[PDB]
Amino acid sequence: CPAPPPGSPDIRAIGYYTDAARSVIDPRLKTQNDAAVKPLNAFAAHVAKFADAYAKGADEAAGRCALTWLDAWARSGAMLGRMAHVNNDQSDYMRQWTHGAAAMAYLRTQALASEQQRTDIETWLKRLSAANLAYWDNPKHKRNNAYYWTGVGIMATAVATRDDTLLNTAQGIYRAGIDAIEPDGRLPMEMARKRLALHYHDYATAPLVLMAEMARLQGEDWYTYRQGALERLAARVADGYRDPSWFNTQSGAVQETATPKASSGWVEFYRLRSPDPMRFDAMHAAGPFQDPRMGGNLTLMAQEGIVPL
Ligand SMILES: [Cl-]
Structure with a gap:
């Protein structure tokens, strides 16, 4: 169990797209951001690694290692300070993603927490929930996939x-995404991403499915809300990796060629809930999928449950 990094209250990320549709990457700005947020990505990668190792069984020390990192950042008020604004809201986006990563790890490992670990971490996760929610109170921040990613941390904190x-x-965050789906299956704000339109339909589906899957821990079936709307969206994503013809036309840009990876692992859960599961076999074959921002190994979590028991 390596030493827990410093949980600085401040974040200074750097947005790195060059165009209005936020679809072409400035590589020098991307490298600068990667270095600037390195502690936040490192924190996410490790708490998820520890949670995955805990779920393997016969390794409560790993689960305890995750809790020590979480408790350390909680006691230092990590990410509750200044969200430095450079050329966009990337710092707030980092806090949304890192809150989700931290809350998922706590949700998966909290059985091993002590009482002060429980109180320190849960108070911190709720403070992050309040802060990330206040960001979206500004109507100028349009509620695209980043809004649904905010819901990952809110939901994991809610369940834990x-x-x-x-x-x-x-x-309400989840249902806001379901409501935004058009009859043809698109999400307008993600279709506006030109060559990344398919990627962002995939990227928007991921937190919606994970939220629904966490709702199952409370016995609730959120797939019945506007039943079939999430299926139309998920089916477009699966069809898009087979043939981007539809995304090309609807987005006005030839899609960037890429295979499903990481957060695409929502399919591991959703293929168990869909009325036509085999439609997702081609995406499933690209597994296994691992994403710290979604709790770690999505392939194993879909098979074994999010919380190891
Ligand atoms: Cl600054």
Whole structure:
């Protein structure tokens, strides 16, 4: 169990797209951001690694290692300070992603927490929930996939703390994404991403499915809300990796060629809930999928449950 990095309260990320559709990357700005947020990505990668190792069984020390990192960042007020604004809201986006990563790890390992670990971490996760939510109170921040990624951390905090208020808030974030799906299956704000339109339909589906999957831990079936709307979106993503013809036309740009990876692992869960599971076999074959921002190994979590028991 390596030493827990410093949990600085401040974040100074750097946005790195060159165009209005945020679809072409400035490599020098990308490298600068990668270095600037390195501690935040490192924190996410490790707590998820420890949670995965805990889930393997016969390794409670790993689960305890995750809790020590979480407790350390909680006690230092990590990410609750200044969200430095350079050329966009990338610092707030990092806090959204890192809150989700931290909350998923706590949700998976909290059985091993001590009482002060429980109180320190849960108070911190709720403070992050409140801060990330306040960001979206500004109507100028359009509620695209970043809004649904915010819901990952809200929902994981809601379930881990059994907080009915936060549960209702997270349900509203999820349902806001379901409501945004058009009859043809598109998400307009993600279709505006030109060559990354398919990638961002995939990237928007991922937190919606993970939220629904966490709702199952509370016995709830969120796939019945506007039943079939999430299926149309998920099916477009799967069809898009087979043939980008539709995304090309609807987005006005030839899609960037890429295979499913990382957060695409929502399919591991969703293929178990879809009315036509075999439609997702081609995406499933690209597994296994691992993403710290979603709790770690999505392939194993889909098979064994999010919380190891
Ligand atoms: Cl600054």
